[PDB]
Amino acid sequence: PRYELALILKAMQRPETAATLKRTIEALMDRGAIVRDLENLGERALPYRISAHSQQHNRGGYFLVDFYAPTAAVESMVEHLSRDIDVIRGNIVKHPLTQELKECEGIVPVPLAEKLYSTKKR
Amino acid sequence: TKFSIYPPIPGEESSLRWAGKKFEEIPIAHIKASHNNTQIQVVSASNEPLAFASCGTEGFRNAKKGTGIAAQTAGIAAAARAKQKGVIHIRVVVKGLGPGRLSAMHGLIMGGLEVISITDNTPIPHXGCRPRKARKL
Amino acid sequence: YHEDRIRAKFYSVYGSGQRAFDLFNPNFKSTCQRFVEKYTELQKLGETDEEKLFVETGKALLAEGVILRRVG
Amino acid sequence: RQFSYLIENMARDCGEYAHTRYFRGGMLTNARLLFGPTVRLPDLIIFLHTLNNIFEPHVAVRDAAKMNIPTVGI
Amino acid sequence: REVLQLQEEVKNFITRENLEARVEAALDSRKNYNWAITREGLVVRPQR
Amino acid sequence: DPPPSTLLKDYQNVPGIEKVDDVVKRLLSLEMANKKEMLKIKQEQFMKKIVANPEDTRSLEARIIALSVKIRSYEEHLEKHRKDKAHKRYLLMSIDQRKKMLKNLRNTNYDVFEKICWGLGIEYTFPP
Amino acid sequence: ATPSLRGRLARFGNPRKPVLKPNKPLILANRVGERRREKGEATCITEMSVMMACWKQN
Amino acid sequence: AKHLKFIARTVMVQEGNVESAYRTLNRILTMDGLIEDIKHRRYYEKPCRRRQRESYERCRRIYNMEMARKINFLMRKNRADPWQGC
Amino acid sequence: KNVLKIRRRKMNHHKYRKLVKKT
Amino acid sequence: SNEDLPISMENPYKEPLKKCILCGKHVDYKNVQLLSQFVSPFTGCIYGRHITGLCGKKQKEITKAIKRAQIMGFMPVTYKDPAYLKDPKVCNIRYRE
RNA sequence: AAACUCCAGUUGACACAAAAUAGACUACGAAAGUGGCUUUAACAUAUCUGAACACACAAUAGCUAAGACCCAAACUGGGAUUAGAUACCCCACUAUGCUUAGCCCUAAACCUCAACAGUUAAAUCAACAAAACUGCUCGCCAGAACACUACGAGCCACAGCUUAAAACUCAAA
Numbered sequence A: 001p002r003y004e005l006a007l008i009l010k011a012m013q014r015p016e017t018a019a020t021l022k023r024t025i026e027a028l029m030d031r032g033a034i035v036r037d038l039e040n041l042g043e044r045a046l047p048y049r050i051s052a053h054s055q056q057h058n059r060g061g062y063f064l065v066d067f068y069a070p071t072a073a074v075e076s077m078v079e080h081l082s083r084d085i086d087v088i089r090g091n092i093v094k095h096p097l098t099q100e101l102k103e104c105e106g107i108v109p110v111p112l113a114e115k116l117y118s119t120k121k122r
Numbered sequence B: 001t002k003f004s005i006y007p008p009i010p011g012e013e014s015s016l017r018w019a020g021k022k023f024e025e026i027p028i029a030h031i032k033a034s035h036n037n038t039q040i041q042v043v044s045a046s047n048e049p050l051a052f053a054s055c056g057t058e059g060f061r062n063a064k065k066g067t068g069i070a071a072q073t074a075g076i077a078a079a080a081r082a083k084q085k086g087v088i089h090i091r092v093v094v095k096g097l098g099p100g101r102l103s104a105m106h107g108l109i110m111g112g113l114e115v116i117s118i119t120d121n122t123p124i125p126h127x128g129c130r131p132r133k134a135r136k137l
Numbered sequence C: 001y002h003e004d005r006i007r008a009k010f011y012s013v014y015g016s017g018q019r020a021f022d023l024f025n026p027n028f029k030s031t032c033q034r035f036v037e038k039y040t041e042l043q044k045l046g047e048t049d050e051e052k053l054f055v056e057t058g059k060a061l062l063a064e065g066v067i068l069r070r071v072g
Numbered sequence D: 001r002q003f004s005y006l007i008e009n010m011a012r013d014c015g016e017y018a019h020t021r022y023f024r025g026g027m028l029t030n031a032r033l034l035f036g037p038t039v040r041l042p043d044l045i046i047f048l049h050t051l052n053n054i055f056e057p058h059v060a061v062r063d064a065a066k067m068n069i070p071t072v073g074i
Numbered sequence E: 001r002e003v004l005q006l007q008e009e010v011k012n013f014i015t016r017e018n019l020e021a022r023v024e025a026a027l028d029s030r031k032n033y034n035w036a037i038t039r040e041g042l043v044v045r046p047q048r
Numbered sequence F: 001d002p003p004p005s006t007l008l009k010d011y012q013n014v015p016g017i018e019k020v021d022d023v024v025k026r027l028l029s030l031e032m033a034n035k036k037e038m039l040k041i042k043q044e045q046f047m048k049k050i051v052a053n054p055e056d057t058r059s060l061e062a063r064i065i066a067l068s069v070k071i072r073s074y075e076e077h078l079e080k081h082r083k084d085k086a087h088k089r090y091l092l093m094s095i096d097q098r099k100k101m102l103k104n105l106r107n108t109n110y111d112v113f114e115k116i117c118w119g120l121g122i123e124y125t126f127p128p
Numbered sequence G: 001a002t003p004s005l006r007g008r009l010a011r012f013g014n015p016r017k018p019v020l021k022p023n024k025p026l027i028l029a030n031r032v033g034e035r036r037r038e039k040g041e042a043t044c045i046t047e048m049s050v051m052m053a054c055w056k057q058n
Numbered sequence H: 001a002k003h004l005k006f007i008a009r010t011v012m013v014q015e016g017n018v019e020s021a022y023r024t025l026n027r028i029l030t031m032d033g034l035i036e037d038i039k040h041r042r043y044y045e046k047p048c049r050r051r052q053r054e055s056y057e058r059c060r061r062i063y064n065m066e067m068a069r070k071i072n073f074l075m076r077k078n079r080a081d082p083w084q085g086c
Numbered sequence I: 001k002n003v004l005k006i007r008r009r010k011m012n013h014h015k016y017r018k019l020v021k022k023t
Numbered sequence J: 001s002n003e004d005l006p007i008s009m010e011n012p013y014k015e016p017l018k019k020c021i022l023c024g025k026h027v028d029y030k031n032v033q034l035l036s037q038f039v040s041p042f043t044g045c046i047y048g049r050h051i052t053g054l055c056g057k058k059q060k061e062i063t064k065a066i067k068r069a070q071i072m073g074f075m076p077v078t079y080k081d082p083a084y085l086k087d088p089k090v091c092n093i094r095y096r097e
Numbered sequence K: 001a002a003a004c005u006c007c008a009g010u011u012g013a014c015a016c017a018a019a020a021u022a023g024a025c026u027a028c029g030a031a032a033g034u035g036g037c038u039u040u041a042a043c044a045u046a047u048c049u050g051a052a053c054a055c056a057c058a059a060u061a062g063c064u065a066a067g068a069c070c071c072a073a074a075c076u077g078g079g080a081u082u083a084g085a086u087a088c089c090c091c092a093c094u095a096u097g098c099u100u101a102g103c104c105c106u107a108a109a110c111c112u113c114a115a116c117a118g119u120u121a122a123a124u125c126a127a128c129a130a131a132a133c134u135g136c137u138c139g140c141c142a143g144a145a146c147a148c149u150a151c152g153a154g155c156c157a158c159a160g161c162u163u164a165a166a167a168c169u170c171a172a173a
């Protein structure tokens, strides 16, 4: 079904980052995925230090990859992202828009529990 | 401006100064208040040791070390050796919930040092090593 | 009661007015009660639309000098 | 306690008796000991308030039933 | 209705043709998922 | 197994789906769906092969066919996960429940019982 | 707001395992706990330490 | 070890009043439950014992919050006797 | 309830295990 | 008979059911600014529903979203993001008093 | 006191271990169990009850074979306490707790409160505990101790488990 790849890339120059995004997308297409949209949330300092491929990363660029792939394509893509040295962190999750939020009527007050003990005169 | 209890961010620009030194350049006074002993070490911003003191190095041994007055004695001594190297303002990073958690900080104040920030860095594992078994007291 | 729906709508749109209730008087008629009486009379004409009937009832009290300050 | 003053005055005006104070135990069931061997118990008890100050049934309500004394209670 | 809606969306998707151009477009544009909530339920947008 | 190019059960009857782009057809196929949606087509295939009225979902034949599809999934699920104890009990209860359904169907409608066994490849055995 | 007590205790109606196992019935008493006296602590230790420090020096 | 330092659980001392800052830091740790967490982590609490302690605290919280509500509810009756002598 | 019944089985089981271990 | 007898109805004065501040709004693990509004500014501890005031459904959503963001490099764990320290205050908690 | 001093404090690198806060939530699973994150598969039955001759599971501890080493820790060693201390306190360390495969089949496996369908009326009801009952079915129980035992039988179990007596004894338990 529809997935979302929370992709955090190493802070590099424009030609290097652009090559990395294309290379990552081609990996999905090589595994039967149908890429929907490529989003750019910007680049900000990582909340905590991340070590990957014997490299210490303090900053990284944020990107989101939306694609349609079979269930078996999810496992293969995770293995691919680990071997990529330019990817700080890559996680594959369900697209939050696929899930439909059920309408909420509100908040029902909870009455105090009653008849928890016998009415005998202790 | 109104005082803010939150420390200034090193990346951001702040107008707060202490003797011409910014918050990131203030030497740090780490305090390790264990249940039986208190170890105080003062280091500068570049992780350069400046002064170190403890109850065991200030005429207290065995159960006497695990007392507030013993920690206070170490705090005064730690301030004295730090003050020789030009330390005036310190940032306190207290670790542990021992009896000398606050008294050791008092020794630094009475020794001629100024406290500008207090930080607690007690190690709390988030699930980690299984601690020792309960005592059958 | 049937008029309780009218009171709920009146308190929702206008709210309690500056006039104070006097429960001592057995024949006391509040602004909300006066609104209900006009609402009942205009209903007997043949109006069956709640929205149209509600607005017309408010206009009648305004023509009679009743102050009707809405919450908005 | 709010209407204790009123009830006592009403009883005096109509020539009847009122007990608006704390009800000592045995005023009805053990009346022959508290007052005397020849005491006469009330032939009718009227409760203007059937609950005590802890929101529980008045003791005299149960006691009057024991002494086969009819009760009129609000 | 959903099939018709979904059919139109594919016309502006990423394929092996619109790969380089779409990558460069992302590197120039930005987005802000982050938003805040008040005590009244009002949504506050980040002004950047 | 149904071909991986087969559309979903919900979208198999929408008009004009034969003239949509091949990209949309791939999305609406079984390839871009989970395993449960595949079982719907598998159950539907038998619901028309065997049941005289495929639209009746409360008949004994529909229940056996629906339960048979679940039993097949557990066998596939336990094939990959040999130490999954939770599904092993579910497999063993579903097998026992199907036999109870087979017993009731055989004792009331024997002619359809032959068709159910033939269609699903079920060899009914009397208990020891 | 008081935590709910619906389904917490093991009862006849409750199908689930109990959430709370109170050693006493959850019924409000007619009395509250008496005020607890503050534990005694050593006082004027700082002043004593300063006074005794000069004695060692003098 | 991998987060930025001098941000978490840091209190700035105002005008050299270290006593107020330390109490503020102590209260923040207590409110977030860090102080109570550290003490119970000194010696391992077995899962059977932890559930018994949690159930006791949860039952304690229910009684404490219910009794507190009644005290506030009846506090308006703490006035003087309006029917003195009756 | 007291554990008097359990204690009797506790001692019987303990002596049985020692007897089994002994012989 | 008598037309003044009470009739059977639902409560017309029944106020609408109260809703949490996040009712009807999506919660996303990438929405760090929203998530940081429900953690302590000094420890990063996730506030309880008695503090945030959220309902049961959104309290679970925020907790799940925070945990996902922390492991995926979107939300700091030990502290609250300083850039979000100036957000509107929606948690009923006071430290300095 | 012993131990350590190849130590401690600050900083950086850095798991086959364990999962703060949320959780004042009360959800899931047949029970046992289940509370870090992601993905896959997936949570039996369109009447109910029903196998202690059946099948599939069953916390922890333990056996078997190959690995992992942080911490905790039977036994053991050292230090102390004590009339003695084969314990409680302190320190060091092993089996073990983890992973893979195969076993073992026990628990206060207890929410000691059977499954389904109902009722809140009468006599509500020994006591206490967690109010009293109806219909139906299955399992189980008939004084205490001997006895979670002997013998027989079955079991990958061999110091084991399951099933389970008798004689003598007591007038109580």
Ligand SMILES: [K+]
Pocket (backbone or CB within 6 Å): B126, B127, K019, K036
């Ligand atoms: K955790």
Ligand SMILES: [Mg+2]
Pocket (backbone or CB within 6 Å): G015, G016
């Ligand atoms: Mg359940």
Ligand SMILES: [Mg+2]
Pocket (backbone or CB within 6 Å): G023
């Ligand atoms: Mg008890």
Ligand SMILES: [Mg+2]
Pocket (backbone or CB within 6 Å): G033, G036
């Ligand atoms: Mg108290």
Ligand SMILES: [Mg+2]
Pocket (backbone or CB within 6 Å): H001, H002
């Ligand atoms: Mg780490």
Ligand SMILES: [Mg+2]
Pocket (backbone or CB within 6 Å): I001
């Ligand atoms: Mg007892």
Ligand SMILES: [Mg+2]
Pocket (backbone or CB within 6 Å): I008, I011, I012
């Ligand atoms: Mg014996």
Ligand SMILES: [Mg+2]
Pocket (backbone or CB within 6 Å): none
């Ligand atoms: Mg020594």
Ligand SMILES: [Mg+2]
Pocket (backbone or CB within 6 Å): none
């Ligand atoms: Mg270190």
Ligand SMILES: [Mg+2]
Pocket (backbone or CB within 6 Å): none
């Ligand atoms: Mg683990």
Ligand SMILES: [Mg+2]
Pocket (backbone or CB within 6 Å): none
């Ligand atoms: Mg685990």
Ligand SMILES: [Mg+2]
Pocket (backbone or CB within 6 Å): K023
């Ligand atoms: Mg907790």
Ligand SMILES: [Mg+2]
Pocket (backbone or CB within 6 Å): none
């Ligand atoms: Mg998970």
Ligand SMILES: [Mg+2]
Pocket (backbone or CB within 6 Å): none
């Ligand atoms: Mg999962």
Ligand SMILES: [Mg+2]
Pocket (backbone or CB within 6 Å): none
């Ligand atoms: Mg089920």
Ligand SMILES: [Mg+2]
Pocket (backbone or CB within 6 Å): K050
């Ligand atoms: Mg059955």
